[PDB]
Scaffold this active site. Structure first.
Site, short mmCIF file in Angstrom:
data_model
loop_
_atom_site.label_atom_id
_atom_site.label_comp_id
_atom_site.label_asym_id
_atom_site.label_seq_id
_atom_site.Cartn_x
_atom_site.Cartn_y
_atom_site.Cartn_z
N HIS A 30 0.95 -1.17 0.12
CA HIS A 30 0.04 -0.16 0.08
C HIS A 30 0.82 1.19 -0.14
O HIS A 30 0.38 2.32 -0.15
CB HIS A 30 -0.84 0.13 1.19
CG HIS A 30 -0.45 0.28 2.44
ND1 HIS A 30 -0.27 -0.81 3.33
CD2 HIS A 30 -0.24 1.58 3.01
CE1 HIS A 30 0.05 -0.47 4.41
NE2 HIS A 30 0.15 1.19 4.65
N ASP A 62 0.08 -7.88 1.75
CA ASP A 62 0.23 -6.38 1.82
C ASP A 62 1.80 -6.48 1.74
O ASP A 62 2.31 -6.22 2.57
CB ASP A 62 -0.41 -5.70 2.64
CG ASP A 62 -0.14 -4.20 2.72
OD1 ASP A 62 0.43 -3.68 1.80
OD2 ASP A 62 -0.32 -3.52 3.76
N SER A 89 3.47 1.97 8.78
CA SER A 89 3.38 1.13 7.56
C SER A 89 4.60 0.67 7.04
O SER A 89 5.49 1.56 6.56
CB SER A 89 2.43 1.63 6.51
OG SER A 89 1.08 1.36 6.99
#
Ligand SMILES: [Cl-]
Ligand SMILES: [Cl-]
EC number: 3.4.21.-
Lengths: 223, 166
Positions: free
Chosen positions: A41, A86, A177
């Site tokens: 992402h 991811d 992240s």
């Protein structure tokens, strides 16, 4: 990182900063001298990557390198199902010389062990909603697949695992992240997503389950 | 889709942390507000009100642990503070408006909206069931109000102004 502390400087020398116009937006993890693993992402058409950092000011960090990268490859099943798979691999334009402050880490082949305490690090938000000046570290513990699926179904997928949710309110947060979750000396996860707000009792964060991808990683790096 | 959504100062829009005004590019004199729809006693429908500018600010939220928003992300959109989950947008069938934007007090982990580049700004797109096909949010004029509602192919185009005036 919620309820952590400053990392011992350069104690996580695989940590990569992904920066956009001089501001961090994600982290990644150096897994080979020419490759950084991060969350899919976090994908961009090109990157500026900071290695060997503690503060994010490279001009105050001896041994640091700010390196360019053009090529990155998202896992082919990213976001099918939504939020799953991811991970992406970023190829640096050139291989870095490893040192004591810039070093790759091995990826776990074994899957996470429920209950095990692990370390997560990053430059994302603190409990007070501010960004830290130096890399933060915190411990979080792996939760069972039964608890993960109970909280996150129908979005729980085995390309994920859950960690945290303690009374201690220790967690990863926005801007963490793509950064590492280290278990028993190996890279076990990447910071991926969670239910907001971060650091809620009983609500663990979700991490990319890298033990599922060791073959795809190896093949991508070797191709 | 890998494009980062930016505000009117060209800065990335934050994930939940900051509020923003959705300023129509050709209706800067108007702003988002709540109004009544159907027979409801409380105002729960979102309208573009010519009497409020810049209107009620929104926050854009993704569960991803990133502090910027990309055009490809599924978002919740909400009025009010980060800490409150009143004010969360959803799209609800309501005659005779059609698929109307309304506020609710519950929130899914993944919202059904995306913010997508259009013309000089952005449109809001609603994805029923978080599937592949999106429906543009535009304006439906009924009962002397301009409701935000699905109007596929006729989006209301907005620029996104950080709400630092408050
Ligand atoms: Cl402006
Ligand atoms: Cl009715």
């Amino acid at each position: 990182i919620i309820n952590g502390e400053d990392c011992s400087p350069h104690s996580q020398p695989w940590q990569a900063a992904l920066v956009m116009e001089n501001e961090l937006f994600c982290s990644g993890v150096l897994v080979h001298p020419q490759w950084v693993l991060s969350a899919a992402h976090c994908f961009q058409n090109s990157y500026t990557i900071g290695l060997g950092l503690h503060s994010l000011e490279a001009d105050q960090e001896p041994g640091s390198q700010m390196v360019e990268a053009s090529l990155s490859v998202r896992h082919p099943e990213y976001n099918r199902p939504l939020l799953a798979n991811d991970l992406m691999l970023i190829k640096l334009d050139e291989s870095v010389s490893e040192s004591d402050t810039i070093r790759s880490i091995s990826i776990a082949s074994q899957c996470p062990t429920a209950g095990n305490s692990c370390l997560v690090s990053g430059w994302g938000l603190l409990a007070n909603g501010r960004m830290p000046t130096v890399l933060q570290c915190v411990n979080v513990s792996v939760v069972s697949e039964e608890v993960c699926s109970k909280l996150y179904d129908p979005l729980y997928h085995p390309s994920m695992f859950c960690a945290g949710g303690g009374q201690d309110q220790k967690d990863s947060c926005n801007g963490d992240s793509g950064g590492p979750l280290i278990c028993n000396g190996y890279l076990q996860g990447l910071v991926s997503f969670g239910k907001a707000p971060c650091g809620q009792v009983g609500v663990p964060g979700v991490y990319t389950n890298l033990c599922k991808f060791t073959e795809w990683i190896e093949k991508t790096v070797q191709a | 889709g890998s494009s980062v959504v930016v505000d009117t100062n060209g800065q990335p829009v934050s994930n939940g942390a900051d509020a923003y005004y959705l300023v129509p590019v050709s209706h800067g004199h108007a702003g988002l507000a709540l109004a009544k729809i159907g027979n409801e006693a409380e105002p729960r429908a979102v309208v573009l009100d010519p009497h409020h500018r810049p209107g009620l600010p929104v926050r854009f939220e993704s569960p991803l642990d990133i502090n910027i928003i990309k055009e490809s992300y599924f978002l919740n959109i909400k009025f009010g503070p980060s800490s409150s989950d009143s004010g969360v947008w959803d799209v609800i069938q309501q005659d005779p408006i059609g698929l109307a934007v309304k506020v609710t007090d519950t929130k899914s982990l993944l919202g059904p909206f995306k913010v997508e580049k259009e013309g000089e700004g952005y449109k809001i797109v609603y994805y029923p069931e978080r599937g592949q096909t999106g429906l543009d949010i535009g304006l439906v004029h009924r009962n002397d109000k301009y409701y935000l509602a699905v109007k596929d192919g006729e989006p209301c185009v907005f620029k996104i102004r950080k709400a630092t005036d408050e």
